[PDB]
Design a protein around this nucleic acid. Sequence first.
DNA 1: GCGCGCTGAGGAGGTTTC
DNA 2: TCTGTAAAGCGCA
DNA 3: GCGCTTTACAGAGAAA
DNA 4: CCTCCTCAGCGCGCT
Length: 254
Amino acid sequence: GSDLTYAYLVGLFEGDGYFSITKKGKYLTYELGIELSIKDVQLIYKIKKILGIGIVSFRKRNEIEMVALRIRDKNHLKSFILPIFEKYPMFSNKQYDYLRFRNALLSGIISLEDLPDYTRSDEPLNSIESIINTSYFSAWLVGFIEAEGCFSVYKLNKDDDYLIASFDIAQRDGDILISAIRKYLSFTTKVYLDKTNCSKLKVTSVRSVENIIKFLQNAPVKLLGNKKLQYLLWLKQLRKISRYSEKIKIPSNY
DNA sequence: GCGCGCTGAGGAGGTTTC
DNA sequence: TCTGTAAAGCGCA
DNA sequence: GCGCTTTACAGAGAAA
DNA sequence: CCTCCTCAGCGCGCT
Ligand SMILES: [Mg+2]
Ligand SMILES: [Mg+2]
């Protein structure tokens, strides 16, 4: 990878991965994993390549196929993973998972009984300005998008053929995170908090759309998975929708 | 040559955030 | 994540 | 006062 | 995203 394609990785992991210290009979299993739709087998192997470690597995949970990259080897974790996340730390209230994980690990905790009682605080760690001002952000956001962003098109009413074309992204307990992104890309839609503590950001404007495209075209790194394809197909329909077409530039990649 | 302490690949059950 | 629905804003004819 | 455009709000599940 | 369990199996210190 690049100095920065790793920042891309914590991005992806923050949004779709997970740190976990689980019960393994008498002992513990330390791991980092991402489980994605089989639609990203190809991406899973690009991650293994970048990181250089990790076990890949497949399963059906019967009609949905899925791929997973899983790193449980503690030496490899200490030797390759911590370092990444130390250098390019996550931003959301998730770092609590990594800090907790890290500590238990470095402490040499190997039994369930000496493993601290842990529960993620919903309490944020940063606030807009700090996220937005960290160097690697631009890259991180690319992966975070790879992971949780959504490109889509839908008619506004059943009957008539008036398309909308939106880009959205949400996160539980992440008002500060979601808002910060919102600021960064200059959206002005109102971030919506749902039934859960899930902050949803969504845009439809000709100017908003114009903006992700530009952020992406000028982001340090690149989307390389299914989301990349989702975006390219989006791009495409964006040409058959006039209001957008006579209003922005677009396709070669990302 | 074996029993012990501990480990991770392999395999899979159970919730819920996107 | 992905796709809406019901309901506005904004000219302008 | 009607065409075109954005927006607040939010419900299923597949993909986490 | 999150969690648990089985089982070769590896290095040790003994019988
Ligand atoms: Mg996530
Ligand atoms: Mg994803």
